[PDB]
Subunit: 148 residues, 3 copies
């Protein structure tokens, strides 16, 4: 059986008067993510991880972020792949993410047509180090397993 | 069969006044990590990720009276992964530290992790990188670990 | 069905007077990457991921930072030897995915060429090799164009 892995990376700046949307979840915060779309850093990293696993290139080559994640899933199936699992990490000094995670995971599992038990979202601070630890941006990392 | 991957990340500040412990190994150095075992946390996180059990923060709170050191948490993690129905297939990882030299300590760390995970030794790998004097890591202000894990149900 | 995964990281400083070589492609640019070898950040990260998947240590173990035979070393040749030691360990490579993070130059026009180089060195079809390119959204030393980073994941099978 023809397994493939992919890995994704994303980061966006924290700016004033933007809403903070991570994993499809709007979170109350003084700042939000700057990007050309809704800047959903978690969903972007997963998207890239999925594109990588199917050897379809990346987010820049192909293109709200949930519609984009859905399209990615469609193009992955187009290529003949099925998604086995997604895992990920959000790196954010603030605000607290713990309470929003199950929701993010539910958003992701819906968009990808996966059962909840095949999707995971983890959260880390940056221990006050670098631009992340200063709350100047937020990073996400993702890993995806697919099979042909 | 029913394979899953997981990935882990971790970082801790590196300052005078503490012992340096990485992958269960104490390392002579003029600094230490605020036990703070980056390598073992990233790997634990990777294992929960693969199992889709959340993360180390949900399982072992900076609160709970039940918790101990990073190898104990790794064992408990492994046991919880087993109960969800997953056997661990392999682990790989990278420590990014500008200093001190990690090469001599690598087989020791791999030995701890394989013991803790109940794996054949040839299923655990640990790599080491500098950050080429770039950023907080390259200035020695902290140390990062990265981990990946394959599991099967 | 004895599958293994690996992951890899690399960074190098971007400096005046050096060739810019990434994924084995020489990119026209006024700066290049600094290292002992040709400092190909992408191939190094992929080499790490392969060594890691096979549990063979890492690129420092196999091709020391200090052995003068690796001065100006072609990193494609290092990747090929890596693939060779992975197969000799009994693994076949199934796929590689990877990411480059760089403020500049534009990497999109060279990405296919990099994928081609990697697929040849690993003896894979193009459709099992993927290369992605990111900016760091202007954050940190990567945003300041001080270095270029790469990440890789590889799946192999015994
Ligand atoms: N920002 C956060 C980092 C880690 N854990 C959280 O719950 N929130
Ligand atoms: N800190 C280290 C960086 C790179 N190699 C080592 O062996 N140790
Ligand atoms: N340096 C680059 C970053 C992102 N995309 C590119 O095409 N190039
Ligand atoms: Cl940038
Ligand atoms: Mg990083
Ligand atoms: Zn993004
Ligand atoms: Zn930690
Ligand atoms: Zn390198």
């Amino acid at each position: 059986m023809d397994f493939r892995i992919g890995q994704g990376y994303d980061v966006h700046q924290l700016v004033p008067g933007r809403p903070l949307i991570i994993g499809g979840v709007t979170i109350p915060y003084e700042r939000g993510l700057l990007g050309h779309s809704d800047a959903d850093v978690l969903l972007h990293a997963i998207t890239d991880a999925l594109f990588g696993a199917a050897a379809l290139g990346d987010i820049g080559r192909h293109f709200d972020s949930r519609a984009l994640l859905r399209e990615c899933a469609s193009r992955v199936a187009q290529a003949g792949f099925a998604i086995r699992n997604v895992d990920s990490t959000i790196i954010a000094q603030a605000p607290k993410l713990a309470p929003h995670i199950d929701a993010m995971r539910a958003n992701i599992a819906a968009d990808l047509d996966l059962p909840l038990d095949r999707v995971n979202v983890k959260a880390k601070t940056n221990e006050k180090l670098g631009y992340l630890g200063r709350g100047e941006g937020i990073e996400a990392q993702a890993a995806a397993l697919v099979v042909r």
